Amino acid sequence: VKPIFSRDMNEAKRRVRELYRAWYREVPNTVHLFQLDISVKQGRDKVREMFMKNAHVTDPRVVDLLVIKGKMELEETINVWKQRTHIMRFFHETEAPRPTDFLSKFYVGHDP
Amino acid sequence: RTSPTGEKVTHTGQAYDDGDYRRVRFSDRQKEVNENFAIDLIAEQPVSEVGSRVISCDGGGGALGHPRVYINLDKETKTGTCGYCGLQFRQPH
Amino acid sequence: ELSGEMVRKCDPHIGLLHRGTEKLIEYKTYLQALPYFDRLDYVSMMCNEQAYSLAVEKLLNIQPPPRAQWIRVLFGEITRLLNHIMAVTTHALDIGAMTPFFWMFEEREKMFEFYERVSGARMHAAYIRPGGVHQDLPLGLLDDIYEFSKNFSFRIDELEEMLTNNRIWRNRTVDIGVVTAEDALNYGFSGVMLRGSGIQWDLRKTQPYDVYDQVEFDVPIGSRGDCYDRYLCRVEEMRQSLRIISQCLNKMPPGEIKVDDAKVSPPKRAEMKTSMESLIHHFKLYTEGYQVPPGATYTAIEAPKGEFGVYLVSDGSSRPYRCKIKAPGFAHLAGLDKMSKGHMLADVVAIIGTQDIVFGEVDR
Amino acid sequence: KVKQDMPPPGGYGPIDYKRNLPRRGLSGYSMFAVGIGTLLFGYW
Amino acid sequence: HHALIPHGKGGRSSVSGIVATVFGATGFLGRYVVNHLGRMGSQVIVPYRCEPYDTMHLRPMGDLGQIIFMEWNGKDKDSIRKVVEHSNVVINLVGREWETKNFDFEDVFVKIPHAIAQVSKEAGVEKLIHISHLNADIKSPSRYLRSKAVGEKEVRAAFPEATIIKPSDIFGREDRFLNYFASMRWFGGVPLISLGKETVKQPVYIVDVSKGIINAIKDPDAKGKTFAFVGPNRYLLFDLVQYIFAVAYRPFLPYPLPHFAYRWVGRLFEVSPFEPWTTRDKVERVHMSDMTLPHLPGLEDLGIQATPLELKAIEVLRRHRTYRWLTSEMEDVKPAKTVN
Amino acid sequence: LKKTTGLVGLAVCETPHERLKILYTKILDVLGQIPKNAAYRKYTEQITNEKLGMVKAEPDVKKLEEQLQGGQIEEVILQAENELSLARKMLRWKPWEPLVEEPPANQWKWPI
Amino acid sequence: DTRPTIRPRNDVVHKQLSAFGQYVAEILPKYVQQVQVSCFNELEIFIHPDGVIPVLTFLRDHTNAQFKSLADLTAVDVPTRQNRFEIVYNLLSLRFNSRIRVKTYTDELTPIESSVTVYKAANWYEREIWDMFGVFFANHPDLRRILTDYGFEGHPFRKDFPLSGYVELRYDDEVKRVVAEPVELAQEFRKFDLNSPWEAFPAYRQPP
Amino acid sequence: TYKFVNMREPSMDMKSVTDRAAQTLLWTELVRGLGMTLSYLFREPATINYPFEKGPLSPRFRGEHALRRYPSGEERCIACKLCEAVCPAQAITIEAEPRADGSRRTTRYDIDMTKCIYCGFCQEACPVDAIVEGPNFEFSTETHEELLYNKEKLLNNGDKWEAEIAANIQADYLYR
Amino acid sequence: GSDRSRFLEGKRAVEDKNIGPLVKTIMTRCIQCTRCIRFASEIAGVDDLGTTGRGNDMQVGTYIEKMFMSELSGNIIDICPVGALTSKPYAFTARPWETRKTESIDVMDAVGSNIVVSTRTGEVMRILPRMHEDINEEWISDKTR
Amino acid sequence: ASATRVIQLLRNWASGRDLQAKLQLRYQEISKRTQPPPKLPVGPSHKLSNNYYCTRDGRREAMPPSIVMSSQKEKKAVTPAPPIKRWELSKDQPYL
Amino acid sequence: KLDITTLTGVPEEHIKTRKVRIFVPARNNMQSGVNNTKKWKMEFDTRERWENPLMGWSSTADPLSNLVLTFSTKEDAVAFAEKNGWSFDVEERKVPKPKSKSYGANFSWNKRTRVSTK
Ligand SMILES: NC(=O)C1=CN([C@@H]2O[C@H](COP(=O)(O)OP(=O)(O)OC[C@H]3O[C@@H](n4cnc5c(N)ncnc54)[C@H](OP(=O)(O)O)[C@@H]3O)[C@@H](O)[C@H]2O)C=CC1
Ligand code: SF4
Ligand code: SF4
Ligand code: SF4
Ligand code: SF4
């Protein structure tokens, strides 16, 4: 199939690393500009966590699309198009912890 | 009517039980209850007598009522009842 | 991006009014999707109904009755007066001229009860439906419309007295937001945004719909492409609407206001309560609705803000599969940066107003 | 009989739809002369 | 009798069966208790003696019909009856740090608690959550802590199976502890008895206290237990205030003020018919070191791990900074020395 | 001479006939660079020859505009420029070649 | 048929559109796959997805096709196809007073050449197609969210995207900000099964 | 078939040039606009003395919903549920059971005025003129919950506005 | 069919017949398609339903006041195209367009009949047969229904 | 309007027109708010004979779009339509 | 294999815990029409629908409770389910058997098909 930006996973992994460097070097500015009440480590760990969620992906086309969406998210953060509400949406705080144990799920509700 | 808790009952029979927290919404406020139970109001209407074997009721007013329906009056034990209006008709016996 | 007050870059961020109309339409029947178009351009409501009605009728392969078409045009131009009053006065209000806003909005109030007396709603009448209109004109409505349109010319002339020859208004609009004819076509501009640059194109003349081929009116054409010329076009379009309204008030034909096809348009309540066939169809049309034959169409009309088009896709059921809405202001706002090059901050305020943008249609 | 809302027989009256911004004031010569005369009277 | 089966996913439109009457919900802790109750889908009943305007901020905390507002009088048991009649949980947060004209520490920390506890038994309320103060002593130097101890015994007498919570010094965005010290900059220096070297405080975050109350209601074993909500670190008063003036980037000028002089200053600020800036009992309570009660369960037993002050102090004191030090992060200021 | 073309951004050309002849000759050359059997070459050559013959036939500007039915003569010049650019682009695109690929099975079937 | 209820049919425009469709198909056989003229006189040309730029540039610049105005640019999601997304181009020819349609197809991954170089209006239309459906347009000057929220995840106008979405907003007093939470509805959207079990139009009957 | 706005060259006669210079220097058009708004000053204002004076309305006005009853006193609603089916906002919720008499009577008829689009489709679909958007438009509430109307609320509304609702129906039913 | 009526006369009316506590009968809607009669006589073996009279006065139903007692009587509600025979328990409760259809399996007996559970707003409104040629064809028992 | 002659003259002079003629406020020329009952006419299909729906079913006379060319198994150049006729200047007010 | 799950934006709970069913809807027994039993449909699994305390309306927290996708063939539905990582459950389409019907059998001479009434 026709590629999007890369023809090999190695080429696709290169763009992921480039995005990570841009994201990693942006977190100190994001905390400073948005006046976040978190630490630089928390944001950088959060960036790592979101990258690690899409770690099982093997199709280079999907990898390119994820980086394309990754750059779009970074542009909003750099340009302060996002707000403190948008930035802190990754750090789910109002959401109560949902246990993943069967017995805990059994006690709560009919959730399969 | 009035429920045992002291709460007026609606025409649908709904009335919050004493063991129901939802009754607290009526604490400093009122419970909106219509005082014109339709089931009581229609039964008050008399049963019209028509010599014909089949009559038609439109609810009164023509186009301001309901679709016209025709009612059989053969059963002497009961009275033909309009589906929409609820009015009763009886063939003289 | 401002260098002092010079606009280096103009980046429009939209979607703050994106309500997902096009997705919500897919879950509702063709009749239920009609009120959605009233809210797209909430300054010109009945025009949006007409565009949707024409698209459905084109797919339905039916024809509205002759009287309904004249009512669609009479209220189509009354709708145009509503929009151009809003378009011009609020444009002047943002410039700084606050007085003409109140003068014309009293006339805008008189036209609002024309909506209310014929439908029961001041703005969202949901009156123009596929197959004609909903109800016939109440007795004495045509006379009152004549009385309003008789004196409305003076209101426009009073508006021109305050703006047309005012040197301050000309300084704020002349040579502001100049759009070349070639750029306007490529950027997708339509309506006044085209005819303000000299392009001779009106969808009521070239591609007439309803009875727009039986009315006589003049298409105002600009010469410089600036805000001032488009201001003159909209003012003249209001005058030309009165020319059309007078013809509609004298050429109104007798007849029914719905296509006499009870499988598309609901039967009369008198027929519904007496006829078995009428009750069945009334029952089905208001629960499932009419099935539209499979196919797709792009029907566009000359809305007050430009070309308003609807790309309707039908899968054969009673609910539209896809309903893409072409907002005339969607393309106009896309060229805001192109038009606001080398202009100050105060000029962008003028340029936004002259494009006649309502974000309901932009953010469908 | 049919009693729709219809235009009166013969139609409605004529509706004005053109600009009628009138011509007002004096000519430039007259206004300038009046101004200069007022200036001269004030000077004297 | 009023037993409700929880339904949903614990969200805004869910049902939790936690129908509650939060007395004094129009206050620092109240807001958070109501918000935690509201987000779970609980029928929260909010009694109020203030103007409905002051209760407006509680309205968006719950879904439609989940937040009922009804007036109450602390000196009228009948008004208490109609607000706890259909509640399976009653939470008492009524408490003022200053004696008023018509209400004294005895009336707010003894009479009202007893009335709430007594009436709740009459209406059949299952669970009651009373909020005392860590340093509640029957012979405390402060009348505030004195009444806080008398009322604690009376609640257990009126309501034998009632959960009693003794928070240390709750700190938060609308707090009168962190903001209290940060607002002393307007008076020049920072008057501290013995320069704040003879006082140890263990403040608690507002969110942790609120979640502890909610977890206490959810926990079936909290009935009759006495909890003590404290923070994870103990600070000297001088070290804590210096850290407060550190993240606030204010010049810290501490001067030792003798106890009699500080009490005299506190008396002067009591003249204000509005909310006093400080009180004699406020001075004594601040100077009083926090008690340590290892024989009582805390936040840890309820599953909530206490949040260190360092992590949540930037939120409170950011508004107290000038334009120069608004965008500074929360990591530049080093944590103060903890006496642990 | 014409004072203005009416359209904004379109300037009056003092030499319309010469410009039209030059543009049409260039278009004809570019089409001559295209294979004969291609339909684009045949159709465009026919149109260009008709227009060039009409230009050579009539020296009057207004009569030429009426005969061309392309609007004002400046619009005709712009159309000729666009046609020349299109021919140059189609020289690279080569659309006379067979279809790139057939639609996959039921790709244009409606309804579903 | 005839009489007022039916819509009149114009054969002249039908013949003209069919002739022009044959013309376009002859000129551009490399990309044109199918040509149709609907009964209400609307011309559709079906183009292989690689033919976006060539066919559109031809329809814009050709002397016999001056579709210099991009009326609309939308996508249709048909999840029953390999290429579910169907990109539709609506053009207007002010010179000949007619309109034409160009339809291509694309997957959830295969990009489409951006027609910004052809029509400058295609910019925001392609941005909206990307935002609503997920179709990526290569060589696009600025592709980003145009209509959805800034931190929005998912493409809503897809047929498999839920009507109410997955997340909802509200103001939390604890965090002093608007927070996104999983969607919970006080009343569920009552889905209606409205299709009649009887065939309505025999002329569109698909083979068994 | 088209008109040229602007596109009007000025005469360069010395009299015309002098008139234009006088307009520029003495601000003639500014005084003209000043006179226009001064004339508007002495007009009669179009304000109405609300709430003592109310704006014009029509019998077709779509306002607060209400469930009407037959002259006999019984509800017209026979729970056909097509008013709920046609409602484009899905604001109507209907549950019905065979009443003690055996008739089709709703047990729940709930309309959230906070979701309704005041389209009228409900009153137009009802085959017995039961649900009818009445003439009331001033029913603003201080809380959201009051706008979630019950069957009792609608029935009560109908009984209150019946006189007017009937009169409006009688005035307008010939157009429907 | 057409979209309007030319019938300017008065419609007929038929006295309702009580045939049991399950099938609500409004015989004015009967179109005399004789589906119920054939279904009884063949699938149910109960030769109780029939037509009495002739011409426009022909009426379907038992001549005497008899109850149509059968374990498969419930299917005459489904076969009947018009609403002449309707489910008395399901009467007036819901409309077809709003009900959500869940295809399930019957457990009342060991036949394992295929049924459709019509739910609306989280509540079972009715049970309808689901076609399975090898198990229950098109019918379900009265208990299952 | 209830305006004195002096006020009316001042208003007319300041406006420069006769305002008392085309007053914006409505006094009596409006239609009556209680109109007589109407009687709307029936459509063209309200007849008892020669009115079978098959002869007037526009919705069912639509057809699937006609395929003109499918890739699946000297002509003159053809325009989409005749070139648009040049518009003609208005004869009421050719130049505003 | 297509793994567009990371691009659809669906949360993890509604990708793995879900159970998509692929089936041709059964004919509504109340009608003889079969037009609805011609296209394959895809629906999710029913989840909790509790009662709203204020009004009694049936609330839900399932965003996919109203998704009904229609496919032309079974293979397309299976492919679409595999694209988004949904655990599909295909049910084979059931077509009514061809049945031998004879009006003359109603009046059989030596067979049980002889009817007693018409
Ligand atoms: N750090 C702290 O604040 C700590 C506090 N506590 C205790 O725990 C509780 C926490 O509440 P907190 O957030 O401090 O509250 P606030 O001091 O912020 O507000 C007091 C609340 O109690 C109500 N209230 C006070 N006095 C009366 C009265 N006489 N009659 C009626 N209502 C009254 C107020 O209602 P209104 O606003 O209308 O007057 C308001 O809701 C209090 O009892 C407090 O003493 C214990 C340990 C630490
Ligand atoms: S109000 Fe009318 S339409 Fe609605 S359920 Fe009742 S009878 Fe039917
Ligand atoms: S007015 Fe419209 S939206 Fe409101 S209840 Fe009636 S049909 Fe529904
Ligand atoms: S099945 Fe119904 S319509 Fe047919 S004969 Fe029996 S009762 Fe009449
Ligand atoms: S729903 Fe069917 S059976 Fe009932 S009255 Fe209407 S047509 Fe007759």
JSON list of C-alpha atoms in Angstrom, two decimals, chain H residues 23-116:
[
{"chain": "H", "resi": 23, "resn": "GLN", "atom": "CA", "xyz": [-18.90, 70.07, 1.12]},
{"chain": "H", "resi": 24, "resn": "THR", "atom": "CA", "xyz": [-15.37, 69.08, 2.15]},
{"chain": "H", "resi": 25, "resn": "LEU", "atom": "CA", "xyz": [-14.62, 72.24, 4.15]},
{"chain": "H", "resi": 26, "resn": "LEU", "atom": "CA", "xyz": [-18.01, 73.04, 5.72]},
{"chain": "H", "resi": 27, "resn": "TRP", "atom": "CA", "xyz": [-18.98, 69.38, 6.38]},
{"chain": "H", "resi": 28, "resn": "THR", "atom": "CA", "xyz": [-22.29, 69.50, 4.56]},
{"chain": "H", "resi": 29, "resn": "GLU", "atom": "CA", "xyz": [-23.02, 65.76, 4.61]},
{"chain": "H", "resi": 30, "resn": "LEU", "atom": "CA", "xyz": [-22.10, 65.56, 8.29]},
{"chain": "H", "resi": 31, "resn": "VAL", "atom": "CA", "xyz": [-24.66, 68.28, 9.02]},
{"chain": "H", "resi": 32, "resn": "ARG", "atom": "CA", "xyz": [-27.08, 66.35, 6.81]},
{"chain": "H", "resi": 33, "resn": "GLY", "atom": "CA", "xyz": [-26.70, 63.24, 8.96]},
{"chain": "H", "resi": 34, "resn": "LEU", "atom": "CA", "xyz": [-26.94, 65.39, 12.08]},
{"chain": "H", "resi": 35, "resn": "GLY", "atom": "CA", "xyz": [-30.24, 66.76, 10.81]},
{"chain": "H", "resi": 36, "resn": "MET", "atom": "CA", "xyz": [-31.43, 63.23, 10.03]},
{"chain": "H", "resi": 37, "resn": "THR", "atom": "CA", "xyz": [-30.82, 62.03, 13.59]},
{"chain": "H", "resi": 38, "resn": "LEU", "atom": "CA", "xyz": [-32.22, 65.30, 14.98]},
{"chain": "H", "resi": 39, "resn": "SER", "atom": "CA", "xyz": [-35.42, 64.60, 13.04]},
{"chain": "H", "resi": 40, "resn": "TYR", "atom": "CA", "xyz": [-35.37, 61.11, 14.54]},
{"chain": "H", "resi": 41, "resn": "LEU", "atom": "CA", "xyz": [-35.10, 62.80, 17.95]},
{"chain": "H", "resi": 42, "resn": "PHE", "atom": "CA", "xyz": [-38.53, 64.45, 17.65]},
{"chain": "H", "resi": 43, "resn": "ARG", "atom": "CA", "xyz": [-40.29, 61.28, 16.46]},
{"chain": "H", "resi": 44, "resn": "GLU", "atom": "CA", "xyz": [-42.48, 59.26, 18.75]},
{"chain": "H", "resi": 45, "resn": "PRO", "atom": "CA", "xyz": [-40.45, 56.37, 20.22]},
{"chain": "H", "resi": 46, "resn": "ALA", "atom": "CA", "xyz": [-41.61, 52.86, 19.35]},
{"chain": "H", "resi": 47, "resn": "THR", "atom": "CA", "xyz": [-41.16, 51.53, 22.89]},
{"chain": "H", "resi": 48, "resn": "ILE", "atom": "CA", "xyz": [-44.02, 49.66, 24.54]},
{"chain": "H", "resi": 49, "resn": "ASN", "atom": "CA", "xyz": [-44.59, 49.88, 28.29]},
{"chain": "H", "resi": 50, "resn": "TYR", "atom": "CA", "xyz": [-43.92, 46.28, 29.24]},
{"chain": "H", "resi": 51, "resn": "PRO", "atom": "CA", "xyz": [-45.33, 44.52, 31.22]},
{"chain": "H", "resi": 52, "resn": "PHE", "atom": "CA", "xyz": [-48.30, 46.90, 31.16]},
{"chain": "H", "resi": 53, "resn": "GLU", "atom": "CA", "xyz": [-48.20, 46.86, 27.34]},
{"chain": "H", "resi": 54, "resn": "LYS", "atom": "CA", "xyz": [-47.62, 43.59, 25.50]},
{"chain": "H", "resi": 55, "resn": "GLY", "atom": "CA", "xyz": [-46.44, 43.10, 21.95]},
{"chain": "H", "resi": 56, "resn": "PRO", "atom": "CA", "xyz": [-48.77, 41.81, 19.24]},
{"chain": "H", "resi": 57, "resn": "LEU", "atom": "CA", "xyz": [-49.28, 38.06, 18.96]},
{"chain": "H", "resi": 58, "resn": "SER", "atom": "CA", "xyz": [-51.26, 35.68, 16.75]},
{"chain": "H", "resi": 59, "resn": "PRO", "atom": "CA", "xyz": [-53.51, 32.65, 17.37]},
{"chain": "H", "resi": 60, "resn": "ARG", "atom": "CA", "xyz": [-50.80, 30.46, 15.78]},
{"chain": "H", "resi": 61, "resn": "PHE", "atom": "CA", "xyz": [-48.26, 31.50, 18.47]},
{"chain": "H", "resi": 62, "resn": "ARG", "atom": "CA", "xyz": [-46.27, 28.49, 19.76]},
{"chain": "H", "resi": 63, "resn": "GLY", "atom": "CA", "xyz": [-45.70, 28.88, 23.54]},
{"chain": "H", "resi": 64, "resn": "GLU", "atom": "CA", "xyz": [-45.97, 26.78, 26.75]},
{"chain": "H", "resi": 65, "resn": "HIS", "atom": "CA", "xyz": [-47.32, 23.25, 26.02]},
{"chain": "H", "resi": 66, "resn": "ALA", "atom": "CA", "xyz": [-50.60, 22.04, 27.61]},
{"chain": "H", "resi": 67, "resn": "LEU", "atom": "CA", "xyz": [-52.69, 18.81, 27.57]},
{"chain": "H", "resi": 68, "resn": "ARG", "atom": "CA", "xyz": [-56.33, 19.68, 26.65]},
{"chain": "H", "resi": 69, "resn": "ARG", "atom": "CA", "xyz": [-59.50, 17.81, 27.79]},
{"chain": "H", "resi": 70, "resn": "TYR", "atom": "CA", "xyz": [-62.80, 16.96, 26.00]},
{"chain": "H", "resi": 71, "resn": "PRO", "atom": "CA", "xyz": [-65.81, 19.18, 26.94]},
{"chain": "H", "resi": 72, "resn": "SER", "atom": "CA", "xyz": [-66.92, 16.12, 29.01]},
{"chain": "H", "resi": 73, "resn": "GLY", "atom": "CA", "xyz": [-63.87, 16.82, 31.23]},
{"chain": "H", "resi": 74, "resn": "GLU", "atom": "CA", "xyz": [-61.86, 13.74, 30.17]},
{"chain": "H", "resi": 75, "resn": "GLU", "atom": "CA", "xyz": [-58.31, 13.93, 28.73]},
{"chain": "H", "resi": 76, "resn": "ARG", "atom": "CA", "xyz": [-58.12, 13.91, 24.90]},
{"chain": "H", "resi": 77, "resn": "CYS", "atom": "CA", "xyz": [-54.70, 12.17, 25.02]},
{"chain": "H", "resi": 78, "resn": "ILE", "atom": "CA", "xyz": [-55.24, 8.54, 23.94]},
{"chain": "H", "resi": 79, "resn": "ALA", "atom": "CA", "xyz": [-51.54, 7.63, 24.13]},
{"chain": "H", "resi": 80, "resn": "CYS", "atom": "CA", "xyz": [-50.96, 7.14, 20.41]},
{"chain": "H", "resi": 81, "resn": "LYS", "atom": "CA", "xyz": [-47.36, 8.32, 21.08]},
{"chain": "H", "resi": 82, "resn": "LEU", "atom": "CA", "xyz": [-46.87, 9.87, 17.62]},
{"chain": "H", "resi": 83, "resn": "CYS", "atom": "CA", "xyz": [-46.39, 13.30, 19.22]},
{"chain": "H", "resi": 84, "resn": "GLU", "atom": "CA", "xyz": [-43.41, 11.69, 20.95]},
{"chain": "H", "resi": 85, "resn": "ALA", "atom": "CA", "xyz": [-42.35, 10.03, 17.68]},
{"chain": "H", "resi": 86, "resn": "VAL", "atom": "CA", "xyz": [-42.43, 13.27, 15.66]},
{"chain": "H", "resi": 87, "resn": "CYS", "atom": "CA", "xyz": [-40.70, 15.44, 18.29]},
{"chain": "H", "resi": 88, "resn": "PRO", "atom": "CA", "xyz": [-37.34, 16.30, 16.66]},
{"chain": "H", "resi": 89, "resn": "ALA", "atom": "CA", "xyz": [-35.70, 17.00, 20.04]},
{"chain": "H", "resi": 90, "resn": "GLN", "atom": "CA", "xyz": [-36.99, 13.80, 21.71]},
{"chain": "H", "resi": 91, "resn": "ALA", "atom": "CA", "xyz": [-38.32, 15.91, 24.56]},
{"chain": "H", "resi": 92, "resn": "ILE", "atom": "CA", "xyz": [-41.56, 13.95, 25.07]},
{"chain": "H", "resi": 93, "resn": "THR", "atom": "CA", "xyz": [-41.54, 10.77, 27.16]},
{"chain": "H", "resi": 94, "resn": "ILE", "atom": "CA", "xyz": [-44.75, 8.73, 27.19]},
{"chain": "H", "resi": 95, "resn": "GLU", "atom": "CA", "xyz": [-45.75, 5.61, 29.13]},
{"chain": "H", "resi": 96, "resn": "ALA", "atom": "CA", "xyz": [-49.27, 4.20, 29.00]},
{"chain": "H", "resi": 97, "resn": "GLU", "atom": "CA", "xyz": [-51.33, 1.43, 30.57]},
{"chain": "H", "resi": 98, "resn": "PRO", "atom": "CA", "xyz": [-54.95, 0.28, 30.18]},
{"chain": "H", "resi": 99, "resn": "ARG", "atom": "CA", "xyz": [-56.77, 2.43, 32.71]},
{"chain": "H", "resi": 100, "resn": "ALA", "atom": "CA", "xyz": [-59.32, 1.03, 35.16]},
{"chain": "H", "resi": 101, "resn": "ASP", "atom": "CA", "xyz": [-62.02, 1.82, 32.59]},
{"chain": "H", "resi": 102, "resn": "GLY", "atom": "CA", "xyz": [-59.93, 0.08, 29.92]},
{"chain": "H", "resi": 103, "resn": "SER", "atom": "CA", "xyz": [-59.22, 3.24, 27.92]},
{"chain": "H", "resi": 104, "resn": "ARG", "atom": "CA", "xyz": [-55.93, 4.39, 26.39]},
{"chain": "H", "resi": 105, "resn": "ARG", "atom": "CA", "xyz": [-54.66, 6.82, 29.01]},
{"chain": "H", "resi": 106, "resn": "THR", "atom": "CA", "xyz": [-51.05, 7.81, 29.61]},
{"chain": "H", "resi": 107, "resn": "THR", "atom": "CA", "xyz": [-49.44, 7.07, 32.95]},
{"chain": "H", "resi": 108, "resn": "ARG", "atom": "CA", "xyz": [-46.42, 9.25, 32.14]},
{"chain": "H", "resi": 109, "resn": "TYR", "atom": "CA", "xyz": [-46.41, 12.24, 29.78]},
{"chain": "H", "resi": 110, "resn": "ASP", "atom": "CA", "xyz": [-43.15, 14.11, 30.47]},
{"chain": "H", "resi": 111, "resn": "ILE", "atom": "CA", "xyz": [-41.84, 16.96, 28.25]},
{"chain": "H", "resi": 112, "resn": "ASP", "atom": "CA", "xyz": [-38.59, 18.76, 29.20]},
{"chain": "H", "resi": 113, "resn": "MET", "atom": "CA", "xyz": [-39.12, 22.40, 28.09]},
{"chain": "H", "resi": 114, "resn": "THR", "atom": "CA", "xyz": [-35.29, 22.56, 28.45]},
{"chain": "H", "resi": 115, "resn": "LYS", "atom": "CA", "xyz": [-34.93, 20.27, 25.38]},
{"chain": "H", "resi": 116, "resn": "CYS", "atom": "CA", "xyz": [-38.04, 21.26, 23.34]}
]
